[PDB]
Amino acid sequence: CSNEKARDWHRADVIAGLKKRKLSLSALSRQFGYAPTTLANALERHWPKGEQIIANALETKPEVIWPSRYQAGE
């Protein structure tokens, strides 16, 4: 039913996968300053700079957590 578990990392695939080490959206949020609401709703509002915050934690690219959304893009 639409929802959001399409091709992107499920809501738990994001935190479960990241937190698999020692990360939590509440920590990445206050670590830069943006309140938790910003980072949270950063999963739907067009704002790839907030995705860099999360991907920055895995030292990877946001294109890895949202594949079917980009296309060979950099």
UniProtKB/Swiss-Prot annotation:
The keyword Repressor applies. Keywords: DNA-binding, Early protein, Host cytoplasm, Pyruvate, Repressor, Transcription, Transcription regulation. Coiled coil: none annotated. It is found in: Host cytoplasm. GO terms for cellular component: host cell cytoplasm; transcription repressor complex. Residues 25-44 bind DNA. GO terms for molecular function: DNA binding. Pfam families: HTH_35. Belongs to the ner transcriptional regulatory family. This is Negative regulator of transcription.
